[PDB]
Design a protein around this ligand. Structure first.
Ligand code: CA
Ligand code: CA
Lengths: 569, 569
């Protein structure tokens, strides 16, 4: 149950962002042992919310902290909210949360990239309250992303910095006590007419509802009094890639009111094409990251607008949420700009045996299904989402992974019978044991970088050969979901060398030549959109330098050649 | 007399380069007053030759030195040289030289970019000798480049750093006592046959001489026993831009032997065109500088080859020896590679009243004529030189500059009737007073940088309008001899901004569009070839950054766009 909070005449949002008080444990779980939540925090510093905490201070100990940290602020409940339902919402807490209201625990959460909330109607006092949030960053074999602890040092095999903090907005909001809990929308098209299937869940199903469908002019085009209905939109304005159209499911229920934007669009996979509204779609874009200077993974909407301007400028039509769900604000923006999205759960780091009883096991599986349920509940109504990605680069050569991912694939397909399912490959085509469960084959391939570094002449034959093998083995359309080269801005050389701006351009260009000679490729996603931070390592010059743009969102040389190609496509 | 030294059966060269001993004056002219030359130098450091001294040490006092420094080394005269004529040659000493041999002064020279020599046949001893060289860097109103001293601080209004030292090889060489002193070669073409007019001077004009003209496979194609003659070369292999062919004037005189490469090629200026061998030539290239890391203006032949590879790669066909004569090794390289050269004397810095009796006056004028004579005598036989430039950016709006440059132009025309004469403009077209004396009008224009900085849309109309005015006022073909923009490697921005790599490309692009619409433009020379060092100033980020290549000879982004254009012309 996770409708995005709204403001209208009936519902109201109180943002709890700004500056909080903050302190870290000085030994493992010190805050829980000493019950720091039972009184205000002492010996604290300021910490912005939303933001990672790791890059804010000058303190290497805080940057590299392993374990739990403690946030605290105060909030008020006005007299005017006296008889309302009160909800405290967290867009995310990375990775693990324990929430305390006035010294008492009210909820917990596992998973750093999906929202959660707590009903505090009967617990919050009028006037001042104290909100205390314990934030833990430890990843074990039953978390997503996967990791483990050694003796404490945090180990993991994914390539992005394990930022921790309150990365997304914290909201206290009110609704009437009889209210709209959940909404599902599915759409079909018969030539010119759209059909809108909706289902609305309330906590008083016998009472009266009024449902409108409004166009972008806010004009009513359909109307009903049923909580579940199928309604026809004559001459429907379809939601198109690069040309969004959003209708509004506008719902009056008792004293309550909720308005849900949605797009009318169809998806169909053929043998070798990806069809949106019947017309072939070729993915041009990037896997991204929630990453920028100072604030780590913290939501930054000005950064988001800049990134969308860059995506439009360079001719991209799509992105993948590597390697975790992004903020709903980004998903709303993609809905509005007509950007096509591959939505991914954080099942990353399942690589180096990995699928064994003492590591990635049935407990990991059950949590993997739960994360998918939550992702679906949050994003099921976004027209921008066209595909679910259930994993990034698992060690799928292991025979034990076959049963694991058959279970995961069956689960998401039971939740959602309409969008294709996929996941990205890094093992050899000959060894993979899971891609047969997918509708689209996605491969991460770094010819000219991790294979044959510097050997420009070998990139084109290498990727073409591999692509054909992937198509011959599975007979499905193929997306190259990652390829590129680390590139230091300002590093030029003639003849070109790895890390130079010229090499990045040539590397991408030869990979593209291989893709252009295949008839079953339905997309190219360059890695990476922008330089981002990684865990420290000798192959990472202050992070991952595969960005086509710098971390400050300025283009390297290759960006202009990619634009010339994508704008002609 | 200044024939380039050669090695053969009769003549021998001894290089005196390597590591010398070095010391600077601690007060003005300390070394002269204390007669340091009378005994070996004491309290010295090592200094390499050839090289500037400014960038070698970690000492700011030496880098910014004003006045004189002292070089010394030892050389040997072999027993085997017993009865030969002995000559000490300096390729250059910047700017002023006093030469001592075994403690006695033997010659002086004024001007930092042209060679000079001294006959030491009767003054060097068999075995060890001591060679001492005083090197002065002070420029006054009668030097070229122009400058002046204020109270000691050196002032000047040219860009580049006032490097000083022994910048070109020092050579002791030997010839027989009766020998070839000078050679002048001129060529004409009648349809398919070439006519080689030569004049040879010796110090015994009555003695027998034998003169061969040899082709590139060293086979005799013409023969004569005259000191001055006119011999036919049937079916002559012409020297062409991009395809050099060099004949050899191979001269046997008594015991002496000298071999002089030369090329057969015609130059003709028409209304609107610059014809070489009767075919229109469009200059594509750069003004350069003698400048690189560590060694300042020191000759570096490895760097010279790299620059010619770069010029070839980028599609250039020419350069101008911006603001002073270059080393002969580079002129020889241009002869062999077919690179067309504009050869320029150091009349730079006559700008801020400049042409007054207390500044640039008749003493300056007479020295300017002498430098031209020395330049002509050195470079008259190079087929690569197609045009003389007698000044760079003088304040030619002053009425007094008219008689000055009419006199300079008429002098150079008497020395050489075959090659066109020019000089580069920076004053406004309405105020210029000297360009009517030239055969080609050369303008330095920085629209988008020094005028309307950052205003990309104003570049094309401004340049086209100025170009038309120059053509209409003088009716001669036009070269844009400088244009461009400072650019920090690695500085990228979208939208572009001055100093970014993207801006340099667009600025050059928009200037090129203006030139392409003008049927009277016969050349474009971008400023600059490579980043180089300047006197310190708030507009100069560790030198002039207008290079298309960095100072380490690697390309910035714009280099690739220039290459596409120049290579399809
Ligand atoms: Ca959110
Ligand atoms: Ca020389």
């Amino acid at each position: 149950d996770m409708l995005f909070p709204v403001d209208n005449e009936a519902r109201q949002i109180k943002e709890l962002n700004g500056i909080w008080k903050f302190k870290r444990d000085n030994y493992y779980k010190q805050g829980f042992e000493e019950k720091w939540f039972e009184k205000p925090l002492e010996d604290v510093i300021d910490m912005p919310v939303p933001s990672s905490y790791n890059d804010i201070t000058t303190d290497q100990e805080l940057r590299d902290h392993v374990g739990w940290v403690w946030y605290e602020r105060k909030f008020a409940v006005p007299r005017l909210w006296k008889d309302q339902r009160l909800v405290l919402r967290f867009g995310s807490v990375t990775h693990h949360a324990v929430i305390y209201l006035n010294g008492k625990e009210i909820t917990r959460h596992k998973g750093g990239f999906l929202p959660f909330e707590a009903d505090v109607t009967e617990m919050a006092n009028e006037g001042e309250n104290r909100l205390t949030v314990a934030v833990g960053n430890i990843l074990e074999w039953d978390c997503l992303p996967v990791g483990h602890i050694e003796y404490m040092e945090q180990k993991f095999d994914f390539d992005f910095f394990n930022y921790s903090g309150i990365h997304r907005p914290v909201r206290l909001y009110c609704t009437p006590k009889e209210y709209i809990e959940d909404i599902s929308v599915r759409t079909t098209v018969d030539d010119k007419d759209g059909m809108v299937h909706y289902e609305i869940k309330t906590n008083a199903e016998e009472k009266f509802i009024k449902v409108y469908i409004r166009d972008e002019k806010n004009q009513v085009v359909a109307e009903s009094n049923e909580m579940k209905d199928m309604v026809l939109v004559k001459d429907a304005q379809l939601w198109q890639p690069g040309s969004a159209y959003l209708y509004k499911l506008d719902i009056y229920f008792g004293q309550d009111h909720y308005t849900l934007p949605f797009g009318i669009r169809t998806i169909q996979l053929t043998e070798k094409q990806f069809l949106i509204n019947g017309k072939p779609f070729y993915f041009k874009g990037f896997g991204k990251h929630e990453d920028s200077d100072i604030r780590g993974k913290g939501l930054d909407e000005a950064l988001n607008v800049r990134d969308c301007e860059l995506l439009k400028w360079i001719g991209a039509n799509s992105f993948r949420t590597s390697h975790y769900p992004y903020a709903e604000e980004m998903m709303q923006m993609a809905d509005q700009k007509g950007i096509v999205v591959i939505d991914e759960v954080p099942a990353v780091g399942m690589n180096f045996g990995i699928f064994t009883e003492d590591k990635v096991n049935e407990k990991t599986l059950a949590y993997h299904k739960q994360v998918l349920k939550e992702l679906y509940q949050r994003d099921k109504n976004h027209p921008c989402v066209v595909m679910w990605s259930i994993t990034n680069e698992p060690h799928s050569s292991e025979e034990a992974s076959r049963n694991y991912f058959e279970e995961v694939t069956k689960y998401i397909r039971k939740l959602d019978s309409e969008r294709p399912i996929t996941g990205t490959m890094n093992v050899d085509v000959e060894e993979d044991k899971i891609s047969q469960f997918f509708d689209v084959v996605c491969i991460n391939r770094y010819f000219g970088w991790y294979v044959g570094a510097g050997k420009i002449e070998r990139i084109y034959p290498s990727l073409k050969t591999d692509l054909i093998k992937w198509h011959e083995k599975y007979g499905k359309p193929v997306i190259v979901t990652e390829y590129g080269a680390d590139t230091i801005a300002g590093l030029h050389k003639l003849p070109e060398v790895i890390f130079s701006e010229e090499y990045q351009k040539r590397c991408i260009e030869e990979n593209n030549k291989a893709m252009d000679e295949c008839d079953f490729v339905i997309g190219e996603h360059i890695w990476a959109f922008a330089d981002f931070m990684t865990a420290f390592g000798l192959k990472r010059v202050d992070g991952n330098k595969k960005g086509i743009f710098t971390r400050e969102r300025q283009p390297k040389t290759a960006a202009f050649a990619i634009r010339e190609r994508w704008r002609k496509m």
